[PDB]
Write an enzyme that holds these catalytic residues in place. Structure first.
Site, mmCIF file in Angstrom:
data_model
loop_
_atom_site.group_PDB
_atom_site.id
_atom_site.type_symbol
_atom_site.label_atom_id
_atom_site.label_comp_id
_atom_site.label_asym_id
_atom_site.label_seq_id
_atom_site.Cartn_x
_atom_site.Cartn_y
_atom_site.Cartn_z
ATOM 1 N N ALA A 194 1.065 -1.437 -0.287
ATOM 2 C CA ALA A 194 -0.160 -0.277 -0.545
ATOM 3 C C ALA A 194 0.892 1.016 0.359
ATOM 4 C CB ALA A 194 -0.831 0.112 1.250
ATOM 5 N N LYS A 203 -0.326 4.166 -3.879
ATOM 6 C CA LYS A 203 -0.750 6.200 -3.568
ATOM 7 C C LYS A 203 -0.977 6.611 -4.845
ATOM 8 C CE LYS A 203 3.751 7.422 -3.339
ATOM 9 N NZ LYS A 203 4.947 7.575 -2.565
ATOM 10 N N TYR A 220 5.933 -12.531 -6.150
ATOM 11 C CA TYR A 220 4.981 -12.074 -6.755
ATOM 12 C C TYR A 220 4.408 -13.982 -6.080
ATOM 13 C CZ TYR A 220 3.273 -8.959 -9.561
ATOM 14 O OH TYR A 220 3.185 -7.572 -10.155
ATOM 15 N N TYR A 223 -5.502 -1.738 -20.139
ATOM 16 C CA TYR A 223 -6.159 -1.646 -21.413
ATOM 17 C C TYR A 223 -7.776 -2.078 -21.021
ATOM 18 C CZ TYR A 223 -2.536 1.700 -22.883
ATOM 19 O OH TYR A 223 -2.055 2.598 -22.638
ATOM 20 N N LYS A 269 -10.257 0.165 -20.518
ATOM 21 C CA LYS A 269 -10.868 1.105 -21.241
ATOM 22 C C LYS A 269 -12.144 0.473 -21.651
ATOM 23 C CE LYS A 269 -6.676 3.276 -21.345
ATOM 24 N NZ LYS A 269 -5.741 4.960 -20.692
ATOM 25 N N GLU A 321 3.481 7.385 -27.904
ATOM 26 C CA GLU A 321 3.151 8.333 -26.936
ATOM 27 C C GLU A 321 4.335 9.483 -27.089
ATOM 28 O OE1 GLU A 321 2.160 7.708 -23.642
ATOM 29 O OE2 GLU A 321 2.135 5.392 -23.025
ATOM 30 N N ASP A 326 6.571 -3.694 -22.957
ATOM 31 C CA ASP A 326 5.835 -3.157 -22.118
ATOM 32 C C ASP A 326 4.859 -3.293 -23.111
ATOM 33 O OD1 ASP A 326 5.590 -1.035 -20.826
ATOM 34 O OD2 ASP A 326 7.179 0.593 -21.542
ATOM 35 N N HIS A 330 -0.808 -5.080 -24.527
ATOM 36 C CA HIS A 330 -1.851 -4.124 -24.819
ATOM 37 C C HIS A 330 -2.558 -4.258 -26.097
ATOM 38 C CE1 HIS A 330 -0.838 -2.886 -21.093
ATOM 39 N NE2 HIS A 330 0.356 -1.555 -21.539
ATOM 40 N N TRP A 385 -9.252 16.262 -42.286
ATOM 41 C CA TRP A 385 -10.493 15.833 -41.243
ATOM 42 C C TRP A 385 -10.567 17.632 -40.851
ATOM 43 C CZ3 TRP A 385 -10.138 16.697 -35.801
ATOM 44 C CH2 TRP A 385 -12.017 16.164 -35.587
HETATM 45 N N1 LIG Z 1 2.853 3.472 -13.106
HETATM 46 C C1 LIG Z 1 3.469 2.693 -12.622
HETATM 47 O O1 LIG Z 1 4.458 1.972 -11.847
HETATM 48 C C2 LIG Z 1 2.987 0.256 -13.480
HETATM 49 C C3 LIG Z 1 1.682 0.367 -13.596
HETATM 50 C C4 LIG Z 1 1.395 -0.575 -14.162
HETATM 51 C C5 LIG Z 1 1.814 -1.453 -13.165
HETATM 52 N N2 LIG Z 1 2.311 -1.450 -12.343
HETATM 53 C C6 LIG Z 1 3.138 -2.422 -11.813
HETATM 54 O O2 LIG Z 1 3.556 -2.880 -10.593
HETATM 55 C C7 LIG Z 1 3.567 -3.272 -9.286
HETATM 56 C C8 LIG Z 1 3.603 -2.129 -8.731
HETATM 57 O O3 LIG Z 1 4.824 -1.341 -8.332
HETATM 58 P P1 LIG Z 1 5.486 -0.064 -8.477
HETATM 59 O O4 LIG Z 1 4.921 0.611 -9.276
HETATM 60 O O5 LIG Z 1 4.082 0.927 -7.285
HETATM 61 O O6 LIG Z 1 6.878 0.317 -7.786
HETATM 62 P P2 LIG Z 1 7.660 0.240 -6.543
HETATM 63 O O7 LIG Z 1 7.381 1.043 -5.605
HETATM 64 O O8 LIG Z 1 9.523 0.031 -6.622
HETATM 65 O O9 LIG Z 1 7.192 -1.019 -6.311
HETATM 66 C C9 LIG Z 1 6.293 -0.707 -5.029
HETATM 67 C C10 LIG Z 1 6.163 -1.711 -3.814
HETATM 68 O O10 LIG Z 1 7.040 -2.680 -3.993
HETATM 69 C C11 LIG Z 1 7.970 -3.065 -2.503
HETATM 70 N N3 LIG Z 1 9.319 -3.499 -3.463
HETATM 71 C C12 LIG Z 1 10.525 -1.734 -3.571
HETATM 72 N N4 LIG Z 1 11.049 -2.665 -3.909
HETATM 73 C C13 LIG Z 1 11.274 -4.043 -3.404
HETATM 74 C C14 LIG Z 1 11.963 -4.881 -3.712
HETATM 75 N N5 LIG Z 1 13.373 -4.863 -4.175
HETATM 76 N N6 LIG Z 1 11.510 -6.407 -2.655
HETATM 77 C C15 LIG Z 1 10.446 -6.882 -2.560
HETATM 78 N N7 LIG Z 1 9.670 -5.004 -2.724
HETATM 79 C C16 LIG Z 1 9.622 -3.949 -3.370
HETATM 80 C C17 LIG Z 1 7.465 -1.729 -1.456
HETATM 81 O O11 LIG Z 1 7.592 -2.124 -0.595
HETATM 82 P P3 LIG Z 1 7.447 -0.727 0.971
HETATM 83 O O12 LIG Z 1 7.228 -0.043 0.459
HETATM 84 O O13 LIG Z 1 6.833 -2.009 2.272
HETATM 85 O O14 LIG Z 1 9.381 -1.680 1.276
HETATM 86 C C18 LIG Z 1 6.653 -1.132 -2.334
HETATM 87 O O15 LIG Z 1 5.434 -0.337 -1.378
HETATM 88 C C19 LIG Z 1 4.989 -3.503 -9.849
HETATM 89 O O16 LIG Z 1 5.448 -4.490 -10.235
HETATM 90 C C20 LIG Z 1 4.518 -2.362 -11.909
HETATM 91 O O17 LIG Z 1 5.831 -3.082 -12.788
HETATM 92 C C21 LIG Z 1 3.405 -0.548 -12.136
HETATM 93 O O1 LIG Z 2 -2.425 5.258 -21.241
HETATM 94 P P1 LIG Z 2 -2.096 4.689 -20.712
HETATM 95 O O2 LIG Z 2 -3.065 4.507 -19.923
HETATM 96 O O3 LIG Z 2 -0.718 5.363 -19.666
HETATM 97 O O4 LIG Z 2 -1.288 3.030 -20.957
HETATM 98 C C1 LIG Z 2 0.012 4.143 -20.790
HETATM 99 C C2 LIG Z 2 1.099 3.064 -19.972
HETATM 100 O O5 LIG Z 2 0.946 1.399 -20.409
HETATM 101 C C3 LIG Z 2 1.912 0.452 -19.746
HETATM 102 O O6 LIG Z 2 1.512 -1.034 -19.720
HETATM 103 C C4 LIG Z 2 3.691 0.704 -19.800
HETATM 104 O O7 LIG Z 2 3.925 -0.328 -19.048
HETATM 105 C C5 LIG Z 2 3.745 2.723 -19.774
HETATM 106 O O8 LIG Z 2 5.481 1.932 -20.413
HETATM 107 C C6 LIG Z 2 2.878 2.981 -20.652
HETATM 108 O O9 LIG Z 2 3.353 4.492 -20.405
#
Ligand SMILES: NC(=O)c1ccc[n+]([C@@H]2O[C@H](COP(=O)([O-])OP(=O)(O)OC[C@H]3O[C@@H](n4cnc5c(N)ncnc54)[C@H](OP(=O)(O)O)[C@@H]3O)[C@@H](O)[C@H]2O)c1
Ligand SMILES: O=P(O)(O)OC[C@H]1O[C@@H](O)[C@H](O)[C@@H](O)[C@@H]1O
Ligand SMILES: NC(=O)c1ccc[n+]([C@@H]2O[C@H](COP(=O)([O-])OP(=O)(O)OC[C@H]3O[C@@H](n4cnc5c(N)ncnc54)[C@H](OP(=O)(O)O)[C@@H]3O)[C@@H](O)[C@H]2O)c1
Lengths: 484, 484, 484, 484
Positions: D12, D18, D120, D175, D178, D212, D231, D236, D482
């Site tokens: 969280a 967040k 995971y 997606y 969407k 993008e 990616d 997608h 257009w």
């Molecule tokens: N906008 C995005 O970034 C996005 C979009 C789509 C999907 N995702 C996916 O959703 C998942 C969420 O990750 P995130 O984007 O939020 O990045 P992140 O901040 O690095 O990971 C979130 C949580 O991961 C924990 N963490 C950080 N480093 C770690 C490590 N070496 N080992 C185990 N846990 C660790 C942390 O727990 P603590 O804070 O308690 O230490 C943090 O709260 C990722 O797998 C990402 O690929 C991300």
């Molecule tokens: O149009 P959206 O919802 O912002 O999706 C874009 C993102 O989709 C994610 O799947 C990719 O990992 C990112 O690289 C990309 O920026």
């Protein structure tokens, strides 16, 4: 009341007349298909009588002992008058002897022109000015050939049309009178099995085959004059193409069918010189009889002639239903056999799940000989096998309809002329389109004198035609094994 | 190296065993279609020997004097062990006897259950707990019937599936092993002629026919228990319906095909009580021998029973391809002939130009007897006629493949089990669906006891079935005249 | 070189002339779409002058002060000649006047007959006999109405055709000049998204809507003679039907398009009197001004007249593409709005998986007002929902092509006459079919004097029309909510 | 009775948490779409509290002054628990804490995994062994990415599937959340205007565009590991392809749709290396801010990196509906705009009669931004013109449903998980096919390290991608103008 009908044969002493027309009308009269009050009058330059033409045409009647009484009846309804093809006085003499029959006037007149094309203009103009009925209908019958190219045929067509209406001109193309060519329409427009699949989305290519096992056989002057294109491809193959590619008519009326045919013809572009293969046959050194002589052997052939005895031409019908589908018209004399065949090769099935073992379907409609419809479909191999193999859904006229006699094309054509059905005849517009498709190619060949690829007598023609067929999309595998 | 394969017969002394299984495997071994290291073990309650079952099965082997040596080899590769279907000791005795055979260990066990359904649970559980090979593949084979209704069949299916993986259950529906039923897939997925037209836009109704010229003849207790619906419609007719109505698989793999089959089954609603015609046969006053007795004239049939010997039911597959087209499943014993037939009556040709002389086309695929595909198509009447008449494009196994012996269904099914192909076998989910459509109707008939329409023995069944056929869309004209 | 063009207007003093043709030709000249050497000659019985017609037609030009120089040029190129519609002397007077111009001989003469139908005979015969150009082409223009029934229109069409060829007869149907009406062809035969689905397999019914928010408003004498059927259904709605249902032409030539249109007309059966809902409006008791009077409240309407001001007629096009699909032609005066609409209701999506939440898609091409083509399509409900609602894919001229001006139909029609394009003009055979579809219905209505269903002024006509529409297959739901 | 539901957010304190999941659940709870017994528990290694998470996620809630009371309610239903991802004691402590809530035993637990993929395995193992509800259902939610290639994804998919059933694993592809992606199904399977033309017979090529306008923007270390393929293209674009190309499901159940999608996946062959165009952006010499730096100008990117930030890949679906139609997946970062778009280019209208002025129709569905569906049609040029031009039937959400707020994808995904609808989630078999399609290409690219075609920041990528699109059949004209 049965209206009197009269049949007139121009050039009654001619080869075509005594060989095909008199036996045809005799066969029709034998079956009682004509109206009861039917008379027949012959006309030619030769000073003959009913007995002379009788003894000349009897061997071609195929008569048996059971039909003498009908034979003397038939020749009691026959007559002959001598005259010239340009002297009007002969035509008033013919008209005077013509009205001297039973009901002769109210009679429905009918003229057949079994004459060389060089006298068509004179004969038709004299008939129009002298031999026109005032009560019954008048129908004139012209014969192949129709000119030599676009302008030569167009002048004749305009001369004829300026004299007679389109409902009184009956251009004979005897393959339109064949059983299977008529059956084309019923297969196309009376079956839902063949409705959705008759389009460019399913048909890869269309092949119309015409083969003969003999050459010009010592009569090479006229073939040298014309060529295989003008002889067969311009009329027979093209009419089969029109029947294959035509849209569904509004009804079974002649006008609707001919409108669909001419509409299909209007969508065909010019014949390019890179889509044509020409061949000329030479004597087979190991042949039998006439097989040892080629087209250059026939003395009736000027020396050093480039006239082709074989042709494979691709046509494209640019419309919503036939866009991009080649129409391989391959015809040739002196080939290995005789066959008039309509072959629609369908596309490969989408998403082949049989590991490329499937092959293209081929709805085949063999006009002659051995009239039969068979679709080369893919069935599972019988026995302890799972791979598919080529089979056919066969319907053969000769195993299913043994007891019925498929009549000669001329019989049916003459019956249609008598009944007024003009569906199976060539219209002026259709002739114009047919001639303008091939005229540039004919003129290019005449002016350039190319060298046709030699092919030995009795062979399957030049391999260049097969190369063309492979190039234009047609696929030949040779894996089709058929047993009767 | 060829792995050892062992064929197992539960109830080796049973009627089905000695009448169908042993002749089938004997024919398979005679052609060398079985693996070289093939052994066979028989199992039943009766204390028999190899010689006794040999002399019992000899009249059904159709042996020849030149096949004698192969016969002794076959019976040298045969063995028999007796035991009980509930006692485990017999089961590990059978396992130990198996281990005393050419590399029994690595041998590939293959179980067949030719037993009454009342012992399937015990036999399957004992086989699972005692008779499983630890090296090679193990497959069991269960036999019709599969329960009595949705819940009764579901409990048995879940008991079997909880013991064996779906790649091990081989539910026999021997009409899947027929030549024409398997060909159905090739006919529609290897041809571009049958693809575009295979939908509700062209098909008006689908009729699946199963007829028997004979009744039950003293075996009426089991038929009284079951009824013609759960005898033939739940399995044979419904599987033919699945193969007719299935979508194109991604590949010829078993799992894909079974997936589209169950997908099509899931689109059928349960049977309404107003779309069912039921008939019970009575003896013909002028019948011959067996024909003089009715279904109520059989002593082993309980008195005053309403079980029907005929059923015509309309099914609907509500999906994008089969929405609104009825599926008339007509079956009946004591009918006028024997015929397994798949009939697709196509829609009337849109915009009829032949003055209503055309009639609905029908692709007919006769499974048995005299295997043949013929599409009832409209061709032009041969001779001097212009109206179309009904004809067919016929492909008959026997006039085209006379030298090829179409094998029995059990032969091909057992060969599929040996080869690991599960395409022609019933998986649990389509069984559940098939019982789901018919269970409410069966329960309603069992509770209400309707009165089936009496129909004379050897007649064409009740006329109410024909009335239903006309009501739901099927058109019958009776003008089709066929000559061989 | 720009050949001289002369635009001759019969009945220059006429109402239709001064309010529609003179503004049309003035607008065409103002945009420089006419040939440089173009002159206009007026002709009528009134002894007016160029200045008289000038001041009479100024208010309908919508002219602007900055266009005064071009207006002065326009009226310097205008002329007027007084005469009679049957006295030849006036005709050669007009010929001598017309010849006394620049190139007044090689000029391309163009005649507009803005006259009542009772003088077409005399005007056409005199124009043919006296007023033809021996060098340039001569094209005549005729106007609605064309007779009253089959024979009345046939006699006029035969008289006109006996004097002019089909390339010189230009029959005006100003709804053929509308933007959407001509855009129908581009929608149909230039888009692959509307080609495969344009048949009976996907369309449930065809509705062509015509509505007027005002009644006859003081000219009931002219409308009483004809009726709404002869006024709208015979020409406007029927030509819209032809353009909707026509097969793809071979080419964009006029002859091909008109041939397709007449072919489609040939496939329509005669109107049965059981598919017609006639309505006559009655004065709204709480209306404003004109709305307070009914069709029988107009002094010039004959007393006790059963003429209908509303009609809903179902047509069936018995052909391969439109077999069984109804064609509801709903027209009516004194309705709730002004609107010409082409509504194509598609069939229910086969195998509906959305729990009957979906409804029939509708292709709408609104000719007028606010020209727009939109497809009432099923999209998922925006927001936190999963069910679909009915939406549209909208293309509106006014929000996409705001800066371009939509010209009047007469402008483009006259430009087409000048350019020789006869694409959007009615042929004689089209008139024959359009009149034979309706003639027995109109004759029976005239003979019987039926009673039209009364409907309040400003309402949507009789509810029996809605009953007929729902009976013939059209599904009205009323759940379509649209916001601009 | 409303069953208690618990929303658990693993990690969280994470960035993704967040930024996206707390505002999403807050928005869902604000509109009352959640059951009224709903509680949320947070878990991560960080020692934060409810107030800490509140103050950290407040700026991303987009809160307004009128909803404080809702915020206090929401955060009164909020809780946080600290612990480790591998220590069991933390998991039993979480179970004790979360059971100590109202109905904390019958509550429907629902878990979200906002964690890096490296944990995971351990997290799923611990949550299955310790934190499973024995009364209510349990659903686990995982997040992108799913491995790096075929085997890396397979190992984690098997580990997850070996612990949870397929009805409890919810694979997130936002997606699929969407609006347009979900709406694709209603477009396809609820409209008769998009069903018949949705096949290879009418579609020339398929383009799925993802662009993008910004580069990796200082996050190059993470993108260098994966590349644009892994990616966006692997998930997608490819799921959009599956949903576009899928066959119509039997019913709107999740399993039917998912089965159809995997069936479409199974028909695609591995990606050849001769149809892939790779690009890596370099700094624009006249850019602004980040536009002046390329992918090599980012410190965290390893030196000499050949990772591609753009890709155009051609895919083929070897099945009955999509055989031969190329599927161009063109995606790239640092391009000229932001856009997700589904473009279906149809074939040329066969037998074009408008002299090559017509162009291919293009059904275009823009997922984001400015959700709109428009078909690039060919309509007649308005005004004094007759040639067709490109136009569109436009339905834009913002002009038709401007007052309806389209919710975020995560909101609808969470609501679907709460309601048990698993239509829009990735199956393990779907993942396997998606990964085996691209795995050989990725392995080859890694082993050989090709050099992507450089393209300046803000450009439309390499021109070689345009060359490939032209070669595979896509016809780009650039004449489409257009105006809004
Ligand atoms: N906008 C995005 O970034 C996005 C979009 C789509 C999907 N995702 C996916 O959703 C998942 C969420 O990750 P995130 O984007 O939020 O990045 P992140 O901040 O690095 O990971 C979130 C949580 O991961 C924990 N963490 C950080 N480093 C770690 C490590 N070496 N080992 C185990 N846990 C660790 C942390 O727990 P603590 O804070 O308690 O230490 C943090 O709260 C990722 O797998 C990402 O690929 C991300
Ligand atoms: O149009 P959206 O919802 O912002 O999706 C874009 C993102 O989709 C994610 O799947 C990719 O990992 C990112 O690289 C990309 O920026
Ligand atoms: N034409 C057919 O007969 C046919 C066709 C299709 C499917 N089937 C199915 O295949 C199976 C084969 O059976 P069948 O037709 O051959 O009839 P069956 O002779 O009565 O049964 C076959 C064997 O099963 C044993 N058996 C019979 N009744 C039993 C009972 N109450 N309890 C335990 N064992 C019993 C007997 O073994 P022992 O001799 O050792 O005592 C008998 O020899 C049946 O289920 C039948 O429904 C039969």
């Amino acid at each position: 009341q049965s209206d009197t009908h009269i049949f007139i044969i121009m050039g009654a002493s001619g080869d075509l007349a005594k060989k095909k027309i008199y036996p045809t009308i005799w066969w029709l009269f034998r079956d009682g298909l004509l109206p009861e009050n039917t008379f027949i009058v012959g006309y030619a330059r030769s000073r003959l009588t009913v007995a002379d033409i009788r003894k000349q045409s009897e061997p071609f009647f195929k008569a048996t002992p059971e039909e003498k009484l009908k034979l003397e009846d038939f020749f009691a309804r026959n007559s002959y008058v001598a005259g010239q093809y340009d002297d009007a006085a002969s035509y008033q003499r013919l008209n005077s002897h013509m009205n001297a029959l039973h009901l002769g006037s109210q009679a429905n007149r009918l003229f057949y022109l079994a004459l060389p094309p060089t006298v068509y203009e004179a004969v038709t103009k004299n008939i129009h000015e002298s031999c026109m009925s005032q009560i019954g209908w008048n129908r004139i019958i012209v014969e192949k050939p129709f000119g030599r190219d676009l302008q030569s045929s167009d002048r004749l067509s305009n001369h004829i049309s300026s004299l007679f209406r389109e409902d009184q001109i009956y251009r004979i193309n005897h393959y339109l009178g064949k059983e299977m060519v008529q059956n084309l329409m019923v297969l196309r427009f009376a079956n839902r099995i063949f409705g959705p699949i008759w389009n460019r989305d399913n048909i890869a290519c269309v092949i119309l085959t015409f083969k003969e096992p003999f050459g010009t056989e010592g009569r090479g002057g006229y073939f040298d004059e014309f060529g295989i294109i003008r002889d067969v491809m311009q009329n027979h193959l093209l009419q089969m193409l029109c029947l294959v590619a035509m849209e569904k008519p509004a009804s079974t009326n002649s006008d609707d069918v001919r409108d669909e045919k001419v509409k299909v013809l209007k969508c065909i572009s010019e014949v390019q010189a890179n889509n044509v293969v020409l061949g000329q046959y030479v004597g087979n050194p190991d042949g039998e009889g006439e097989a040892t002589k080629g087209y250059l052997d026939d003395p009736t052939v000027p020396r050093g002639s480039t006239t082709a005895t074989f042709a494979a031409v691709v046509l494209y019908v640019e419309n919503e239903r036939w866009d991009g589908v080649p129409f391989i018209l391959r015809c040739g004399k002196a080939l290995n056999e005789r066959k008039a065949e309509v072959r629609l090769q369908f596309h490969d099935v989408a998403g082949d799940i049989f590991h490329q073992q499937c092959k293209r379907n081929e709805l085949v409609i063999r006009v002659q000989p051995n009239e039969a419809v068979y679709t080369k479909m893919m069935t599972k191999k019988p026995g302890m096998f799972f791979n598919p193999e080529e089979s056919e859904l066969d319907l053969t006229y000769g195993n299913r309809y043994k007891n019925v006699k498929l009549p000669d094309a001329y019989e049916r054509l003459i019956l249609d002329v008598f009944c007024g059905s003009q569906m199976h005849f060539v219209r002026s517009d259709e002739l114009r389109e047919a001639w303008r498709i091939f005229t540039p190619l004919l003129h290019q060949i005449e002016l350039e004198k190319p060298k046709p690829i030699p092919y030995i007598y009795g062979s399957r023609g030049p391999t260049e035609a097969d190369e063309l067929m492979k190039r234009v999309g047609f696929q030949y595998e040779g894996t089709y094994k058929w047993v009767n």
